[PDB]
Design a protein around this ligand. Structure first.
Ligand code: LZX
Ligand code: LZX
Lengths: 304, 304
């Protein structure tokens, strides 16, 4: 009973957080095996961020300039290199708390948990989605850079995000763990605008299925629609176009509830056209799009 | 930038979760030092739950009937006792991962994180509030009993909740770690209805302050009000009456933003009377009441 925006247990990731300081800049790092991963802008002063030449700034840095502290103990840095927008600091000790892990580059619409950190210490955990415009709507302040996003499959942590930047609009941008930004963003104090933040249609449908499973059914109607008809409505409301791939992924939810995907699309169509009329769905007064179909199945079945 | 429903990092609590089985019933336990805490209904069959005499059911149980498994290893049970609605199983080994901890009985309106578990294994973490009617709106399925709620002050975990029951209405009831239920609920398969779920006014005001800090300001108006005037409106909308104690707790937010508490009350009054008119506040289309004033300060300042 009940449905909540749930994050993965963060323990396995808390064991990897370290503090990295270079000169007067301090941020978070991720220690896995004998490498510490952190945003390359750790080498920048606030002045340097206006137009940084990272290769030139990195020449003036030696291994002893990167101060890495794991809780209360100092790690010895024996190598450093830049890969895209991240620095990889080779340390002389393998992290004993290193979990089984993978580095993955997620797709827009996919969800993940964020362990927000400051000074190498965890402050909290929340669930995010990579927006279709490649931004994330997080909760990050100065010093949170290097905090990571991840998913967990039983004992394996798949790291997908490292926080680097806040856009002047209050939304967030970052990289995968290979240092490649999601979207067109660059690690420079230049005004960079985000594109249209469209709604993740397949996620809204998955969340409507979660609502039916948990008892919220008022929005079910007597109608059906087609993909092309639904998509004319999705276009008008800045929703992502629904494809047969999305219908396929919703198959298990459709089978469990006995509500055909296109019938749920017709419920969604009427909700877009008529609004909620002051009613709520799973305690929300808007259509939630940060639950994937996999998230809904996982939460509704009890996967640990 | 940004404001999210954030949970505490759950690592310290994940280290305490164990599986407890008695006969054919399996639920979660909390292992702290040499004691495992779990709901007393672990001794019940599904038939027993209609009208259980726990003292009589417990007489037929010995230490060897309680199977406690910490991950893959079995704990030896050397004592057992019932305290209110919890069982305390004395084991022969102190949990090496026991954090600094306290047992606290929270007040309605206070928030906490829940580490939902199944078979002694964590599935996810989310943020809750103890409702004014002493229920929690969680996400729990059969087998989640024994999952706990907690807060963290730097290195100290304050345990406040243990999950026991789902009401026929889909809301949740449980105990503090001394086994005393929050509210009038009893651990019996009897229909028990929840009282009026009022809105936590001081939390909504705190969340309005979080909105102003993060840029969402459209709801600010040119009006003020008084506590008695505001409370006539709060009464009409099933909001908790606002007291001077609540105004006092909002003082730091009022000082930080320069918006007097009673002026924010007048913004809230107009929002209750006029609705949102299709607009959002911090990505929500309703007034959020599960952030305390302390939660807002902590998130907006970066406390780890
Ligand atoms: C103190 S630090 O080392 O964590 N970061 C300082 C610089 C960083 C930055 O302000 N990032 C930031 C601020 C607030 C929230 N989320 C992210 C930056 C990166 C790219 C272009 C411009 C600025
Ligand atoms: C399988 S178990 O041992 O975890 N619990 C079985 C009995 C429990 C129960 O169904 N609790 C429950 C179910 C679903 C979600 N949240 C809570 C119960 C407690 C009090 C009165 C009636 C029933």
């Amino acid at each position: 009973s009940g449905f909540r925006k749930m994050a993965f247990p963060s323990g396995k990731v808390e064991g990897c957080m370290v503090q990295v300081t270079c000169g007067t800049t301090t941020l978070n790092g991720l220690w896995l095996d004998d490498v510490v991963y952190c945003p390359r802008h750790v080498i920048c002063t606030s002045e340097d961020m206006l137009n940084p030449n990272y290769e030139d700034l990195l020449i003036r840095k030696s291994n002893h300039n990167f101060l890495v502290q794991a809780g209360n103990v100092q790690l010895r840095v024996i190598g450093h290199s830049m890969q895209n927008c991240v620095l990889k600091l080779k340390v002389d000790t393998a992290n004993p708390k290193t979990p089984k892990y993978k580095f993955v580059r997620i797709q827009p619409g996919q969800t993940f948990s964020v362990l927000a950190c400051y000074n190498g210490s965890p402050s909290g955990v929340y669930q995010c989605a990579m927006r279709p415009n490649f931004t994330i709507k997080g909760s990050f302040l100065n010093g949170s850079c290097g905090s990571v996003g991840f998913n967990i499959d039983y004992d394996c942590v798949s790291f997908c995000y490292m926080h680097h930047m806040e856009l002047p609009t209050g939304v967030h941008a970052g990289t995968d763990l290979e240092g490649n930004f999601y979207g067109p963003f660059v690690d420079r104090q230049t005004a960079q605008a985000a594109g249209t933040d469209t709604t993740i249609t397949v996620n809204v449908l998955a969340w409507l299925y979660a609502a039916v499973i948990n008892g919220d059914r008022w929005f079910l109607n007597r109608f059906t629609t087609t993909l092309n008809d639904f998509n004319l409505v999705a276009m008008k409301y800045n929703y992502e176009p629904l494809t047969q791939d999305h219908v396929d992924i919703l198959g298990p939810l459709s089978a469990q509830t006995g509500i055909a995907v296109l019938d749920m699309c017709a419920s969604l169509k009427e909700l877009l056209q008529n609004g909620m009329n002051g009613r709520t769905i799973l305690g929300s007064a808007l259509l939630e799009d940060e639950f994937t179909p996999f998230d809904v199945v996982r939460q509704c079945s009890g996967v640990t």
